[PDB]
Amino acid sequence: SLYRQSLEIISRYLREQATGAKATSRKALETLRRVGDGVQRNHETAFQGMLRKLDIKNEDDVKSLSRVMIHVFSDGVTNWGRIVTLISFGAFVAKHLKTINQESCIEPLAESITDVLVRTKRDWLVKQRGWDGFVEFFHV
């Protein structure tokens, strides 16, 4: 249920970001576009350097990234800044892959990201009232 909703949002964001195209999960995506695009624009150069270091070879070479996304939270801190920074890098990575192969898909990547968030941060996510909290946290 919470996995399903996260995967929807994350996948859709990543999917737009790569293809350039297109209740509460609906606002979570608006928020994601607004904020995520910000961090990608703001840190395009750092993401690029990191992306080159990922040696990510194909739509399924997501294990290096998953290792990375895990060590982020490896200090005991979770916040939406980190979470949203992870998804933005996911989008930034999703866009590169199409440069490399217009065919390749974002599913493995969306699932990679969701796995780490939902399955290792479940309790934290829950404590925050879920994507409702994320939406509230970034309200304008």
Binding site: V35, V39, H43, A46, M50, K53, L54, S64, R67, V68, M69, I70, H71, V72, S74, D75, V77, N79, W80, G81, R82, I83, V84, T85, L86, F89, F137, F138
Partner: peptide, 27 residues
Amino acid sequence: ASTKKLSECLKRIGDELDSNMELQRMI
């Protein structure tokens, strides 16, 4: 290996972004 270098980078941006919202919220 270098995984610690990349996670440290994303960690910072996330915190940077978090610090910015935490502020915009306190006011």
